[PDB]
């Protein structure tokens, strides 16, 4: 409700960018882990932590001065909501659930905008 | 000027989706080919043709009833413009230029919206 839509939009663009980097380095996630993390509303936290050595999160790192709990909580919950209703095949995917996350990011952008 | 922004937005979401599918199947593009195709304003046509056996383009296939030349031309030109000013490293990438294309898609969405 007090979430900066402009902030939230940039944060989601940032997620897409960093997931693309993970994919560029050959990282992958199983659909099962992706759905579990999203349902537990902690997909982003998981990435931030697992890939903390390389991941660049100006918006979504809790140690960033740009971090806003409203934006991060909205995003984590949004993954939970969307991953509850879509699956890999809804976007013509099979293997790498990081790419399902990118599709869900676009659904979230629609919600924000 | 007569481009349906709503149409164009959905078309760009579609590009991101189909590129994600290409990446899921292990396809890649070199930065050199990506910059060449974009500069020649034919990156999307190239994908449509090369991957015509699997790619699903409801908006961007010229044989689709949803095809609109204004949207497709805007998008092709937009890739040309953006790929003229950014490079892989601007988005923390190195190898797969398909992922640079996804980042450029977000820049295009900003332009449309």
Short mmCIF file of C-alpha atoms in Angstrom, two decimals:
data_model
loop_
_atom_site.label_atom_id
_atom_site.label_comp_id
_atom_site.label_asym_id
_atom_site.label_seq_id
_atom_site.Cartn_x
_atom_site.Cartn_y
_atom_site.Cartn_z
CA UNK A 1 0.00 0.00 0.00
CA UNK A 2 2.95 2.28 0.66
CA UNK A 3 5.09 0.46 -1.83
CA UNK A 4 6.78 2.68 -4.38
CA UNK A 5 5.59 1.26 -7.71
CA UNK A 6 8.58 2.86 -9.38
CA UNK A 7 10.84 1.28 -6.77
CA UNK A 8 9.06 -2.08 -7.13
CA UNK A 9 9.32 -1.97 -10.93
CA UNK A 10 13.07 -1.30 -10.82
CA UNK A 11 13.45 -4.08 -8.26
CA UNK A 12 11.70 -6.56 -10.57
CA UNK A 13 13.80 -5.44 -13.54
CA UNK A 14 16.77 -6.08 -11.26
CA UNK A 15 15.59 -9.59 -10.46
CA UNK A 16 15.28 -10.40 -14.16
CA UNK A 17 18.79 -9.02 -14.80
CA UNK A 18 20.41 -11.04 -11.99
CA UNK A 19 18.61 -14.25 -12.87
CA UNK A 20 19.83 -13.79 -16.44
CA UNK A 21 23.37 -13.55 -15.02
CA UNK A 22 22.84 -16.77 -13.03
CA UNK A 23 21.64 -18.48 -16.20
CA UNK A 24 24.62 -17.11 -18.15
CA UNK A 25 26.86 -18.88 -15.66
CA UNK A 26 24.99 -22.16 -16.19
CA UNK A 27 23.03 -22.13 -12.92
CA UNK A 28 19.65 -23.80 -12.82
CA UNK A 29 16.85 -24.56 -10.40
CA UNK A 30 14.41 -27.47 -10.29
CA UNK A 31 10.70 -26.70 -10.60
CA UNK A 32 10.16 -28.42 -7.25
CA UNK A 33 12.58 -26.14 -5.40
CA UNK A 34 11.25 -23.07 -7.19
CA UNK A 35 7.65 -23.82 -6.19
CA UNK A 36 8.68 -24.59 -2.60
CA UNK A 37 10.69 -21.38 -2.16
CA UNK A 38 7.96 -19.25 -3.75
CA UNK A 39 5.20 -20.82 -1.67
CA UNK A 40 7.29 -20.09 1.42
CA UNK A 41 7.68 -16.57 0.04
CA UNK A 42 11.50 -16.73 0.13
CA UNK A 43 12.64 -17.26 -3.45
CA UNK A 44 14.47 -13.93 -3.61
CA UNK A 45 16.10 -14.33 -0.19
CA UNK A 46 17.27 -17.77 -1.29
CA UNK A 47 18.97 -16.39 -4.42
CA UNK A 48 20.48 -13.49 -2.48
CA UNK A 49 22.01 -15.95 -0.04
CA UNK A 50 23.01 -18.84 -2.28
CA UNK A 51 24.60 -16.56 -4.86
CA UNK A 52 25.77 -13.85 -2.44
CA UNK A 53 29.33 -14.07 -3.83
CA UNK A 54 28.29 -12.80 -7.27
CA UNK A 55 24.71 -11.50 -7.18
CA UNK A 56 24.22 -7.72 -7.42
CA UNK A 57 21.04 -6.49 -5.74
CA UNK A 58 20.83 -2.72 -5.35
CA UNK A 59 17.14 -2.92 -4.47
CA UNK A 60 16.66 -6.33 -2.88
CA UNK A 61 19.73 -6.70 -0.63
CA UNK A 62 18.69 -5.96 2.97
CA UNK A 63 22.14 -4.38 3.44
CA UNK A 64 21.46 -1.96 0.60
CA UNK A 65 20.37 1.59 1.53
CA UNK A 66 17.85 1.21 -1.32
CA UNK A 67 16.21 -1.76 0.39
CA UNK A 68 12.53 -1.32 1.23
CA UNK A 69 10.63 -4.01 3.14
CA UNK A 70 7.35 -3.11 1.43
CA UNK A 71 8.86 -3.76 -2.02
CA UNK A 72 10.67 -6.94 -1.01
CA UNK A 73 7.69 -8.38 0.87
CA UNK A 74 5.35 -7.53 -2.03
CA UNK A 75 7.70 -9.26 -4.45
CA UNK A 76 8.21 -12.38 -2.30
CA UNK A 77 4.46 -12.71 -1.79
CA UNK A 78 3.85 -12.09 -5.49
CA UNK A 79 6.09 -15.04 -6.40
CA UNK A 80 4.14 -17.18 -3.94
CA UNK A 81 0.82 -16.15 -5.49
CA UNK A 82 1.83 -16.63 -9.11
CA UNK A 83 3.79 -19.86 -8.58
CA UNK A 84 0.61 -21.20 -6.94
CA UNK A 85 -1.25 -20.98 -10.27
CA UNK A 86 1.27 -21.42 -13.09
CA UNK A 87 3.71 -24.17 -14.04
CA UNK A 88 6.73 -24.54 -16.31
CA UNK A 89 4.63 -25.73 -19.22
CA UNK A 90 2.42 -22.64 -19.11
CA UNK A 91 5.41 -20.80 -20.55
CA UNK A 92 6.66 -23.62 -22.75
CA UNK A 93 9.53 -24.53 -20.41
CA UNK A 94 10.72 -27.84 -19.02
CA UNK A 95 13.93 -27.71 -17.04
CA UNK A 96 15.32 -24.52 -15.58
CA UNK A 97 12.83 -22.96 -13.13
CA UNK A 98 14.94 -19.77 -12.99
CA UNK A 99 13.37 -19.09 -16.38
CA UNK A 100 9.90 -19.68 -14.95
CA UNK A 101 10.82 -17.01 -12.42
CA UNK A 102 11.52 -14.57 -15.26
CA UNK A 103 8.06 -15.20 -16.71
CA UNK A 104 6.50 -14.67 -13.27
CA UNK A 105 8.46 -11.40 -13.01
CA UNK A 106 6.55 -10.16 -16.08
CA UNK A 107 3.26 -11.13 -14.49
CA UNK A 108 4.35 -9.12 -11.43
CA UNK A 109 5.23 -6.11 -13.57
CA UNK A 110 1.70 -6.16 -14.98
CA UNK A 111 0.39 -6.17 -11.42
CA UNK A 112 2.57 -3.20 -10.45
CA UNK A 113 1.82 -1.16 -13.58
CA UNK B 1 2.59 6.34 -33.83
CA UNK B 2 -0.35 4.05 -34.49
CA UNK B 3 1.24 1.23 -32.58
CA UNK B 4 -0.97 -0.33 -29.95
CA UNK B 5 1.07 0.02 -26.75
CA UNK B 6 -0.94 -2.80 -25.24
CA UNK B 7 -0.22 -4.91 -28.32
CA UNK B 8 3.46 -3.92 -28.25
CA UNK B 9 3.77 -4.73 -24.54
CA UNK B 10 2.28 -8.20 -25.00
CA UNK B 11 4.57 -8.74 -27.98
CA UNK B 12 7.64 -7.91 -25.88
CA UNK B 13 6.45 -10.16 -23.05
CA UNK B 14 6.14 -12.81 -25.75
CA UNK B 15 9.70 -12.27 -26.92
CA UNK B 16 11.00 -12.69 -23.38
CA UNK B 17 8.97 -15.90 -22.97
CA UNK B 18 10.21 -17.45 -26.23
CA UNK B 19 13.83 -16.49 -25.62
CA UNK B 20 13.55 -18.12 -22.20
CA UNK B 21 12.36 -21.28 -24.00
CA UNK B 22 15.35 -21.12 -26.37
CA UNK B 23 17.66 -20.78 -23.37
CA UNK B 24 15.91 -23.69 -21.61
CA UNK B 25 16.83 -25.84 -24.59
CA UNK B 26 20.47 -24.76 -24.35
CA UNK B 27 20.49 -22.36 -27.31
CA UNK B 28 22.83 -19.42 -27.25
CA UNK B 29 23.89 -16.50 -29.39
CA UNK B 30 27.24 -14.70 -29.64
CA UNK B 31 27.35 -11.01 -28.78
CA UNK B 32 28.72 -10.33 -32.26
CA UNK B 33 25.76 -11.93 -34.02
CA UNK B 34 23.30 -10.29 -31.64
CA UNK B 35 24.70 -6.81 -32.29
CA UNK B 36 24.78 -7.41 -36.05
CA UNK B 37 21.18 -8.65 -36.25
CA UNK B 38 19.91 -5.81 -34.03
CA UNK B 39 21.79 -3.15 -35.98
CA UNK B 40 20.24 -4.55 -39.15
CA UNK B 41 16.92 -4.43 -37.31
CA UNK B 42 16.22 -8.14 -37.89
CA UNK B 43 16.92 -9.90 -34.60
CA UNK B 44 13.31 -11.01 -34.16
CA UNK B 45 12.91 -12.16 -37.77
CA UNK B 46 16.12 -14.15 -37.36
CA UNK B 47 14.79 -15.99 -34.28
CA UNK B 48 11.42 -16.57 -35.93
CA UNK B 49 13.16 -18.18 -38.89
CA UNK B 50 16.01 -20.07 -37.24
CA UNK B 51 13.76 -21.54 -34.57
CA UNK B 52 10.59 -21.76 -36.67
CA UNK B 53 10.18 -25.46 -35.78
CA UNK B 54 9.60 -24.72 -32.08
CA UNK B 55 9.12 -20.98 -31.54
CA UNK B 56 5.60 -19.77 -30.67
CA UNK B 57 4.92 -16.19 -31.75
CA UNK B 58 1.27 -15.17 -31.53
CA UNK B 59 2.17 -11.50 -31.98
CA UNK B 60 5.38 -11.50 -34.00
CA UNK B 61 4.79 -14.20 -36.63
CA UNK B 62 3.86 -12.50 -39.92
CA UNK B 63 1.51 -15.44 -40.56
CA UNK B 64 -0.33 -14.73 -37.33
CA UNK B 65 -3.64 -12.82 -37.57
CA UNK B 66 -2.37 -10.88 -34.52
CA UNK B 67 0.66 -9.64 -36.45
CA UNK B 68 0.94 -5.86 -36.76
CA UNK B 69 3.74 -4.28 -38.81
CA UNK B 70 3.80 -1.18 -36.59
CA UNK B 71 4.52 -3.30 -33.50
CA UNK B 72 7.07 -5.54 -35.19
CA UNK B 73 8.89 -2.66 -36.88
CA UNK B 74 8.94 -0.66 -33.63
CA UNK B 75 10.39 -3.65 -31.80
CA UNK B 76 13.04 -4.45 -34.45
CA UNK B 77 14.12 -0.81 -34.54
CA UNK B 78 14.11 -0.65 -30.75
CA UNK B 79 16.58 -3.56 -30.56
CA UNK B 80 18.77 -1.73 -33.07
CA UNK B 81 18.71 1.45 -30.99
CA UNK B 82 19.39 -0.17 -27.63
CA UNK B 83 22.01 -2.64 -28.88
CA UNK B 84 23.81 0.42 -30.30
CA UNK B 85 24.42 1.76 -26.78
CA UNK B 86 24.63 -1.19 -24.39
CA UNK B 87 26.86 -4.26 -24.17
CA UNK B 88 26.83 -7.60 -22.37
CA UNK B 89 28.81 -6.25 -19.43
CA UNK B 90 26.29 -3.47 -18.80
CA UNK B 91 24.02 -6.20 -17.47
CA UNK B 92 26.75 -8.32 -15.90
CA UNK B 93 26.71 -10.92 -18.68
CA UNK B 94 29.47 -12.53 -20.69
CA UNK B 95 28.40 -15.32 -23.01
CA UNK B 96 24.82 -15.79 -24.13
CA UNK B 97 23.57 -12.70 -25.99
CA UNK B 98 20.00 -14.07 -25.90
CA UNK B 99 20.10 -12.93 -22.28
CA UNK B 100 21.26 -9.48 -23.34
CA UNK B 101 18.17 -9.44 -25.54
CA UNK B 102 16.00 -10.06 -22.47
CA UNK B 103 17.55 -7.05 -20.72
CA UNK B 104 16.96 -4.92 -23.83
CA UNK B 105 13.33 -6.11 -23.82
CA UNK B 106 12.93 -4.48 -20.39
CA UNK B 107 14.40 -1.26 -21.70
CA UNK B 108 11.84 -1.44 -24.53
CA UNK B 109 8.99 -2.00 -22.07
CA UNK B 110 10.00 1.19 -20.27
CA UNK B 111 9.86 2.99 -23.61
CA UNK B 112 6.39 1.63 -24.38
CA UNK B 113 4.96 2.30 -20.90
#
